[PDB]
Design a protein around this nucleic acid. Structure first.
Ligand SMILES: [Cl-]
Ligand SMILES: [Cl-]
Ligand SMILES: [Mn+2]
Ligand SMILES: [Mn+2]
Ligand SMILES: [Mn+2]
Ligand SMILES: [Mn+2]
Ligand SMILES: [Mn+2]
Ligand SMILES: [Mn+2]
Ligand SMILES: [Mn+2]
Ligand SMILES: [Mn+2]
Lengths: 99, 93, 105, 84, 96, 78, 104, 92
DNA sequence: ATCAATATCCACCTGCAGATTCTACCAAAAGTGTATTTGGAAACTGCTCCATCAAAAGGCATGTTCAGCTGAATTCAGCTGAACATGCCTTTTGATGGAGCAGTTTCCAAATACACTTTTGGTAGAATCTGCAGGTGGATATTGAT
DNA sequence: ATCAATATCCACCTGCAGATTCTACCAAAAGTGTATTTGGAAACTGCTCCATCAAAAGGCATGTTCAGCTGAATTCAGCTGAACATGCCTTTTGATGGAGCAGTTTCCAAATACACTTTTGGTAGAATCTGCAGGTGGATATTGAT
């Protein structure tokens, strides 16, 4: 036509896709570097078992997905469809993660 | 190096409820974490109970109260059933 | 030689649970019935989760329970979901759930 | 080993988008990506700090899965599947 | 003389945030507690400090819940708390 | 019994939580919330009562119930 | 000649030791553990009474009441995090009105 | 008969504020506080020793427990006080 | 904007009641001296498994364009919820008797710990079995431009 | 009210990585005997807690009035989604060197055990003395009329 889906159709297509699957959604190597940089500032010369890095990525991705669910409810509560930083701060605040 | 786990017992119970069904080792690891988690929650709550009541012994009575305090609703009723049944059957020699 | 599990009618190991109660500094003494009761409850809750996850594995036309099936079984059951409300299942994903307000008008 | 800098930027915009999709989000404002990086970094600091404390108490140089599991549990973020 | 809407409401916020007295009348609360307890165990007695502990906890819980409800109302560009505000707050807290 | 918890008293609680304006459906919603709270805590406290073979719910029973529920209270023996 | 004075403390080293032995925490208890634990308890107590003494004279009373302890806990960022899921009975709340609620 | 920390909470109050007293209810609140932090540190100490297959709770477990439980500056000063008390106790 | 009128904080008394503090007695707990055992640190070493690299390949991040449609701004009026007066009933306060029951003894019969000895279920590993991942089709909705 | 475009679904197919069974040793359950503890069962105390009582203040229920908040309607600038070219950098699979878990042994600084002595902390009255309930009168704020 050239064919072109309308804004929102692919986003809903991706919600369905990623809610069916369980694969980690952050790239592995970059995340492992993030973990070692943060650990390196706490204690130098640390080593990691590889399952210790996977445990952190599994926990970090479940936290963020969960946070994004609550963020979405706060956006929809404000009569929006778009998540904004104020939504994350409201969710984090009601969870007791921030004063 | 010899590492205990609950895997053979989980697998037996799996065969009971689904004779045709198996389990990936990752799913076994989730079941092992489950058993150990509920163990510590029940045992810990039973440890407190015995302590609040100035008792030095954790008995099936402490286990049962801990179970009531920890499990929601129907899950508690049924666990108490199985637990009471196993104890009476155990004591009847 | 009769195992305490067979005496109690249980698949879970009464002797291991007893040792685990003793070595865990839970109390100075452990009654003979406490490991029996506890091992029965652990067996029961395990059977409860395996039943529901077996069913999910069959709805998905699969012969082998994977973590995903454990998640579906837990999060779709109000009481298991409450009990495991602060637990993460590695490789479990989430439940399919799109807020109505987001579906096309 | 080469020195590690700025690796929170390896948490890319498309990876955050994907996470938000699994969380049900349809539309994402432009400023969400750096908020998420800030939130994720606070999260990892709190858990890794606790994990490394367990390591150092055991006199090890190697963070183990168990260290991460005990740290997750303390933060009220219990994790199943890595209990070895 | 007649104060405009909201002027007395703000005055009450300042009054009650300054004080620490229990804000629910004692006998209704005690009657409600005994009723609820009756659905789990009969002919129960209560220590008076047991009831005071429950009332202290119940009021601190509800006050805290009204703070999060209020933030959810402000977030939706309102000044009035509505049931959906309470419901959102309880959803994010994990109480639902 | 639950309507013993009156509209003026719910307003006072909301006031202490900084609320300025209150919708009319709030009071019945608040009573239901308070009822779930009291059920959950009293169920647990009474479980501590029955386990100690007592007929009297003690302050300590409530204290322990509130700790179990993530609602630690100071000032009543714990 | 008590262990408290020997460690230079007001809090009871001897009692903390008994409570550790009888609390089902571990088979055995080192000698310095009750000392170290007694010292941490005395320090956190001194910190709170420090600030709550202040809250009480900032209000013209000889006597610390629960309201003063609540004001001290909640106006201090680190004590507030430590006591984040704790209720001070008769403590009330911190005065605080959202900006958007104020007049004009 | 009925132990509490009132006597020691009062001794610390005079050290920091000789002029100031404390009400019955506020004393009960400090007793709750001491018992709470005690059980938090002791339970954490307990799990540390178990995770590491040790049967003894020593001041080293107490210290790691304090590091894990107190948030930042509270942790640094608490670790200093405990370290001091163990030193002074050992010396004489 | 300011002046006038009304209403509400809130700083400051006083004279008690009640709640703290102050004293003295005494069992229960902490300290002590002396003897004896033992968890776990230190040293030593086997051998996982972690850090690091190499290379090839292509899955995926990035940057750009373009405009659909979302959020933000604005107006407005219906009607909900705040303020207030008034009449009343539920809570507060008091007391007073009695009883339901904690809380406490002194207790043995039952139950539990513990050292030795023997039996076997459970685990590590190699040997075997096999779902299903990951391809390759078309069959079926589903969406969006006319 | 129909069709091109595109994504999504659904079968079948197989061999290989991942699960299941096999196997043989052995750590830790179970059996036995015996030393030690416990906690339920008896008869008690002396309380707190419940139950009427009963009169009375002040907090609540109610009806009136209208201020102004909410949400419905409308408009539109520009942010964010969709699509695409481009090419970087993650992923996958082995290699290998050695750091450092983890497994054993040795033996002692430090833990427990126990009998007895000292001192502390709980308690419950006597002897303070703080702060609550009222007053008031000025500070400060709100609301109407200009
Ligand atoms: Cl038992
Ligand atoms: Cl020590
Ligand atoms: Mn660094
Ligand atoms: Mn040894
Ligand atoms: Mn819109
Ligand atoms: Mn109008
Ligand atoms: Mn065999
Ligand atoms: Mn497939
Ligand atoms: Mn004394
Ligand atoms: Mn007054």
């Amino acid at each position: 036509k050239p064919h072109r889906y309308r804004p929102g159709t692919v986003a809903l297509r991706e919600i369905r896709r990623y809610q069916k699957s369980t694969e980690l959604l952050i790239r592995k190597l970059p995340f492992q570097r993030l973990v070692r940089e943060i650990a390196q500032d706490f204690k130098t010369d640390l080593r990691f078992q590889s399952s210790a890095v996977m445990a952190l990525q599994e926990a970090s991705e479940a936290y963020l997905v969960g946070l994004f669910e609550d963020t979405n409810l706060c956006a929809i509560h404000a009569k929006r469809v778009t998540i904004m930083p104020k939504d994350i701060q409201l969710a984090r605040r009601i969870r007791g993660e921030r004063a | 190096s010899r590492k205990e786990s609950y895997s053979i017992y989980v697998y037996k119970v799996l065969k009971q409820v689904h004779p045709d069904t198996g389990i990936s080792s990752k799913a076994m690891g989730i079941m092992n974490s489950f058993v150990n988690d509920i163990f510590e929650r029940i045992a810990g709550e039973a440890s407190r109970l015995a302590h609040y009541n100035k008792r030095s012994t954790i008995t099936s009575r402490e286990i049962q109260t801990a179970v009531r305090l920890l499990l929601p609703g129907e899950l508690a009723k049924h666990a108490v059933s199985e637990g009471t049944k196993a104890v009476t059957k155990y004591t009847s020699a | 030689a009769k195992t305490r599990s067979s005496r109690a009618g249980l698949q879970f190991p009464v002797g291991r649970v007893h040792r685990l109660l003793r070595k865990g500094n839970y109390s100075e003494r452990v009654g003979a019935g406490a490991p029996v009761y506890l091992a029965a409850v652990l067996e029961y809750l395990t059977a409860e989760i395996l039943e529901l996850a077996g069913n999910a594995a069959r709805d998905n036309k699969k012969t082998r329970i994977i973590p995903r099936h454990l998640q579906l079984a837990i999060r779709n059951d109000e009481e298991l979901n409450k009990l495991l409300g602060r637990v993460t299942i590695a490789q479990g994903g989430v439940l399919p759930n799109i807020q109505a307000v987001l579906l096309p008008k | 080993r080469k020195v590690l800098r700025d690796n929170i930027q390896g948490i890319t915009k498309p990876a955050i988008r994907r996470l938000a999709r699994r969380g049900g989000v349809k539309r994402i404002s432009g400023l969400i990506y750096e908020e998420t990086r800030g939130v994720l970094k606070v999260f990892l600091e709190n858990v890794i700090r606790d994990a490394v404390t367990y390591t150092e108490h055991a006199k090890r140089k190697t963070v183990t899965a168990m260290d991460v599991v005990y740290a997750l549990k303390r933060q009220g973020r219990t994790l199943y599947g890595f209990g070895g």
